[model samples]
Target: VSGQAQLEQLASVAAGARYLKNKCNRSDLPADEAINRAAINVGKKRGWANIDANLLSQRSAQLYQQLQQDSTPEATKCSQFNRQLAPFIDSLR
Candidate 1:
């Protein structure tokens, strides 16, 4: 769970967290396993070494908090946009 921090690792983790958070615009989001699960897919494609899930989790929390706070006005927030994709798209995949 601990290792050398890499830019690629952070990028992938951020993307993963962003995607999971976006897909579910709710207070009960799966912040715990989102990064671990999505980053696993990223690592499978990029041949990543052991990713630091601890730091990734913190980073994920940071992103989630920021989004929830600034989401109302900021364009980055998912809100209720394209809600259909949440269940059908995410579940089917």
Candidate 2:
């Protein structure tokens, strides 16, 4: 696929991860799950502005649960979370 599509999906995941990162430690879900929910919320609100389409509903929750976890550091694992997004979406059909 093209780089733009890959970049968009990566940003989509990072956007959600950033939401959680800014929220401090008020969350109980794993990093992936939390980010997935956050991503869906942003995508839904923004009308999936940069997302690929309907699959994001599937994309957000499903692919997420497979991975992601982080320590409760002052700086969240957003970069790590962002890293995972590119890898997963790049391989997605």
Candidate 3:
């Protein structure tokens, strides 16, 4: 994919992931549990009934850690965090 296309997709996925993360945290749930809740909601909405929450949570945590460690401007953006964790997002989808 072109850089622009990738960024756009990243932005979309990042927005969703960020929202899920926030919702989960707000509810005082573990990241994995939050992923499970998000997966159910997303699956029902988008026909992704086969989504795997465990993998997504593991990868999401890893990606978030990388973002936390990075000092780059892009790392601070949701899109960049999403892009870095594309594999995790794809699995969730």
C-alpha lDDT of all candidate models, in order: 0.50, 0.45, 0.47
Candidate 1, pairs of clashing residues? none
Q: Which is better, 1 or 3, measured by lDDT? A: 1
TM-score versus the correct structure, for each prediction: 0.46, 0.29, 0.41
User: Local error of candidate 1 at 57, Å?
Assistant: 0.6
Error in Å for residue 82 of model 1: 6.2
Residue-by-residue lDDT tens digits, candidate 3, 1-93 = 453343333333444465435532323323545445544455445544344445555554565565456565642454544455455455564
Q: Give the TM-score of candidate 2.
A: 0.29
Residue pair clashes in candidate 3 = none
Top candidate on lDDT is: 1
Candidate 3 lDDT for residue 76: 44
State the lDDT of candidate 2 residue by residue for 1-93, as single tens digits. 454564346445644444444443424334554454454454555454455434554554443343334344534454455455444333321
lDDT of 3 at 67: 48
Off by over 4 Å in 1: 1-31, 71-76, 79-92
Q: By TM-score, is 1 or 3 better?
A: 1
